[PDB]
């Protein structure tokens, strides 16, 4: 019978905690100490870290790690990573080391197109709305946003294009004003939503003022919502590694052609089996999200975007692909991702500042490259590990059953050898010596 | 690299002490400016043993990245009033959670139904012989042997009421030549289950290869063709899934904007329907759900890459990417629900050593894993409700 707390957010941090610990933790001061042991000693810094979210009562430590020696487009970077899962940072470092002398990582930033929509309904003829949009309203939508977009346009960005989309086949009377945006180094959410909110104002007002619509048709115009889309398939970058198959050298002594083919097979499984692609893509995001967090960006957005992209052709599939044509190994990731490097409240987080300074003050597109590299290297590490374990183990077992089949061993004899070599290693001499003992008493 | 030469690779980075890692990093990339060293060190805990503890979760740890740790109080969940811990960096997420809790507190609260707890994993392998011969061997001999050879591995889990639920042979040769799967389903009780599942699959791989090698049903050439590609769990668990739901009479949907309650319910359903039929909205819409899910996932030491991958795969499982929540306004009743596939643990994770994770679990009343599933689904539903309540009353 806990009682609800009124006015919780107005309470001081200390009174929030006293109530919390009394109500749910039996007044045990040890839970209070656990909250306070993560507080920063410095008053201003602690206050700063209580202004990103709301009702903050402590700091959740996420490990801040470094994976060094990433050769990215000819430059050697150390990548900061904030992630709680073990082996993620070590795998990143191991992939960077692997590719350091095999061409490193190369990226192509394809496009930086972000999207938003005014969703609305309208009961009149679609073609009258289209005609009005094409000849009048579209220009008026740019005009009424000139003040909103002045700063961004002086930075090189702005509204790239505006479209009317007839969605009436999906939902009765449903239309969109669909716009694309360049927000430069900003994540862009406030800029986009501000444009979209003015779009809805201009749409409703211009339709009401036009002689082309009946008053019934005007009254039917209703904006549902003005909101950006986190699906940005044209804000996207390719990260890629490539070398000659013969140069895929691993200290595990595995043949490079065998490794190349088994690696490609692991990628193909994720391309055709959705239950594998989910885990495979999750591995990519281990790398992506660790850098998204370290640079103060929104990983729900990068997750929602990447996994939507993974299903965009009608089947949930792998975000990475691989070819082994003509003696060349290629492995690449097309990662749609929207990030910012200025203008966010989280750009005030000092470790976000550290991350951006560490990476060389990257532009948004340069950070897109860095994050896509981190995802590619993480996926590479997982698959390289999964395929080279299967080569290490099967080498001794396949050696054994071929000797036994060359010697025509019975199934009972084959059984006895499985027991005998459970802990022992498989030598060509030892197998034959033991078979000689068994058959000749 | 403006004014110095090209950076040189560091050898033996992980064997450097923490301070030596930092010194190289700041000398190489930050011009030896001690202000950047100070930024790293100001987040170290005063207690040396606690600091070292937080340097053993990941690798190459040189500082602590603060994520805010917040409370959203007054969540009425299946008849109990919970304060939900939330670790998230984005503004308004925690406040929106509190506002949704407040709205539903006197309107029935949140009801959950944990539907199933089935987790999955696969032995992926190739085999060049006749599929029917592999299937017949599996059905009559191998499947039982796969259970037998994991008895020692599953003994601890079975005494907790879990274990391997079923094992199937899947023919994927239409998708890829000679490709097959041993597909297994698992109950891991209060564990996330990763290490338990992967241990079983690795034993499947060994038993599969061994039993085929020993069988007289196959030629030696067919035996040599059997190659295990990988033994790995799947983060897509559509049958480890909970519904969270709110419902009340439409006349009770009273909002401070003065919008009529029937108008609010209709505009709200409209906003949901648009996410159901427009993928570009569904992505953002589901993102809002994950704002709430991920904040509790982090606060309880769980893996949010896994929950993100699972939920967004689920969102496309019928051929189009669509909303994870749904809404009805039939017969004067407002209904709004979320079917969230989610796999989490409340024990046994390296992160249940994180004292704030222990705090979250104690705050929530030491929930079981299915009770945590419910709490997280409520948090997703409440976040989506808050987002859509704002978008239609603005």
The answer to whether position A55 is within a domain reads yes
Q: Which of B110, B359, B257, B101 lies closest to A8, judged by CA? A: B101
Which of A35, A274, A397 is nearest residue B236 as measured by Cβ atoms? A274
Residue A319 falls inside a structural domain: yes
- Are A4 and B354 a contacting pair at CB < 8 A? no
Residues 6+ apart with CB under 8 A from A422: none
Among the three residues B181, B210, B234, which one is the final residue of a domain in this structure?
B234
Is position A40 within any domain? yes
Residues B339 and B285 in one domain: yes
Asked whether the beta carbons of A203 and A221 are under 8 A apart, the reply is: yes
Q: Could you give the dihedral angle defined by the CA atoms of residues B304, B306, B308 and B309, in that order, rounded to the nearest 10 degrees?
A: 160
Q: Which long-range contacts (CB under 8 A, 24 or more apart) does A172-175 make?
A: A172/A121, A173/A121, A173/A122, A173/A123, A173/A220, A174/A119, A174/A120, A174/A121, A174/B274, A174/B277, A175/A119, A175/A120, A175/A121, A175/A122, A175/A126, A175/A129
In a domain, A396, yes or no: no
Say which of B21, B50, B176 has its CB closest to residue A66. Answer: B21
What span, in angstroms and rounded, lies between the C-alpha atoms of B353 and B265? 44
Domain containing residue A367 = 64-111+233-391
Measured CA angle at B250 (ends B245, B256), to 5 deg: 95
The number of domains in chain B is 3
Contacts for A200 with CB less than 8 Å, ≥ 6 apart: A118, A120, A177, A223, A226
Q: What DSSP state is assigned to residue A9?
A: G
**What is the distance between the alpha carbons of residues A97 and A70, in angstroms, rounded to a whole number?**
8
Which residue in chain B has the smallest CA separation from A60? B67
Do B15 and B83 lie in one domain? The reply is: no
Same domain, B173 and B307: no
Dig out the tokens for A338 from the structure: 């929207």
**Are residue A137 and residue A9 in the same domain, yes or no?**
no
Contact B73 A8 (CB under 8 A): yes
CATH number at residue B170: 3.30.70.420
A222/A288 same-domain check? no
Q: By what method was this entry solved? A: X-ray
First to last CA, chain B: 48
Are the beta carbons of A206 and B252 closer than 8 angstroms?
no
Known active-site residue A298:
yes
A290 with A412, same domain: the answer is: no
Q: Looking at the structure, tell me whether residues A147 and A256 fall in a common domain.
A: no
* Contact present, A270 and A284 (Cβ < 8 Å): no
What SS3 state is found at A126?
Answer: helix
A156 and A210 in a single domain? The answer is yes
Whether residue A270 sits in one domain with residue A137: no
Nearest Cα neighbor of B360 from A166, A381, A60 is A60
Tell me, yes or no, whether B62 and B102 share the same domain. Answer: no
- Taking an 8 Å cut-off on Cβ atoms, the answer to whether B14 and A93 are in contact is yes
Cβ contact, residue pair B70, A53, below 8 Å:
yes
* Residue A68 is assigned to a structural domain of this protein: yes
Classify A333 as helix, strand or coil. Answer: strand
**In Å, how far is A62's CA from the nearest CA of chain B?**
5
Distant-in-sequence, close-in-space partners of A343: CB < 8 Å, separation ≥ 6: A185, A186, A187
CATH number, domain of A379, equals 3.90.770.10
Spatial CB neighbours of A34, under 8 Å, sequence gap ≥ 6: A58, B355, B356, B358, B359
Minimum distance, in Å, between the CA of residue B203 and any CA atom of chain A: 13
Which phi and psi (to 5°) does residue B249 adopt?
-60, 140
Q: Which of A138, A212, A244, A282 is catalytic?
A: A282
Name the percent of chain A in helix, strand, coil, to the closest 5. Answer: 50, 20, 30
Q: Report the gap between the CA of B319 and the closest CA in chain A (Å).
A: 5
Question: Is there a single domain that holds both residue B214 and residue B279?
Answer: no
Q: Kindly state whether residues B165 and B289 are assigned to the same domain.
A: no
> Is A54 in Cβ contact with B70 (below 8 Å)?
yes
Q: How many CB pairs under 8 A join A and B?
A: 384
- A311 occurs within a structural domain: yes
Distance, in Å, from the CA atom of B51 to the CA atom of B62, rounded to the nearest integer, reads 10
Place of tokens 């709301």: A54
């Amino acid at each position: 019978k806990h009682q609800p707390i009124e006015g919780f957010s107005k309470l001081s941090k200390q009174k929030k905690i006293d109530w919390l610990v009394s109500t749910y933790l039996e007044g045990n001061q040890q839970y209070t100490d656990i909250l306070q042991q993560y507080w920063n000693d410095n008053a201003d810094l602690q206050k700063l870290h209580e202004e990103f979210s709301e009702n903050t009562i402590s700091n959740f430590y996420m490990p801040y790690g470094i994976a060094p020696n990433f050769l990215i487009d000819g430059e050697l970077k150390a990548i900061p990573m904030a992630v709680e899962e073990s082996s993620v940072v070590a795998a990143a470092s191991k992939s960077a080391k692997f590719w350091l002398d095999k061409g490193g990582f190369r990226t192509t930033v394809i496009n930086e197109k972000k999207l938003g929509h005014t969703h609305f309904t309208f009961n009149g003829e679609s073609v009258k709305l289209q005609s009005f949009f094409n000849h009048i309203l579209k220009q008026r939508l740019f005009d009424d946003t000139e003040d909103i977009t002045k700063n961004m346009r002086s930075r090189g960005g702005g509204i790239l294009d505006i479209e009317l989309v007839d969605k009436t086949a999906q939902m009765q009377d449903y239309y969109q004003i669909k716009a694309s945006f360049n927000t430069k180094d900003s994540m862009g959410a406030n800029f986009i939503n501000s444009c979209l909110e003015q779009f809805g104002k201009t749409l409703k007002k211009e339709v009401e003022l036009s002689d082309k619509f009946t008053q019934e048709e005007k009254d039917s115009l209703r904006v549902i919502m003005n909101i950006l889309s986190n699906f940005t398939p044209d804000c996207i970058v390719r990260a890629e590694v490539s070398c000659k198959i013969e140069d895929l050298i691993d200290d595990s002594g595995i043949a490079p052609e065998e490794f190349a083919w088994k690696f490609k097979q692991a990628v193909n499984i994720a391309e055709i089996e959705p239950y594998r692609a989910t885990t495979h893509n999750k591995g990519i995001m281990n790398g992506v999200d660790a850098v998204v967090i370290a640079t103060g960006n929104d990983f729900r957005a990068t997750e929602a975007c990447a996994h939507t992209y993974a299903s965009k052709d009608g089947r949930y599939t792998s975000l990475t692909h691989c070819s082994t044509d003509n003696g060349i190994f290629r492995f690449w990731l097309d990662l749609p991702i929207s990030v910012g490097v200025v203008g966010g409240l989280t750009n005030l987080h000092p470790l976000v500042k550290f991350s951006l300074a560490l990476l060389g003050k990257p532009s948004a597109t340069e950070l897109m490259s860095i994050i896509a590299v981190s995802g590619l290297a993480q996926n590479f590490a997982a698959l390289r590990s999964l395929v080279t374990t299967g080569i290490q183990k099967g080498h001794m077992k396949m050696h054994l059953f071929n000797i036994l089949n060359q010697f025509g061993a019975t199934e009972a004899e084959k059984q006895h050898f499985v027991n005998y070599f459970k802990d022992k290693t498989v030598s060509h001499h030892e197998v034959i010596a033991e078979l000689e003992k068994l058959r000749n008493k």
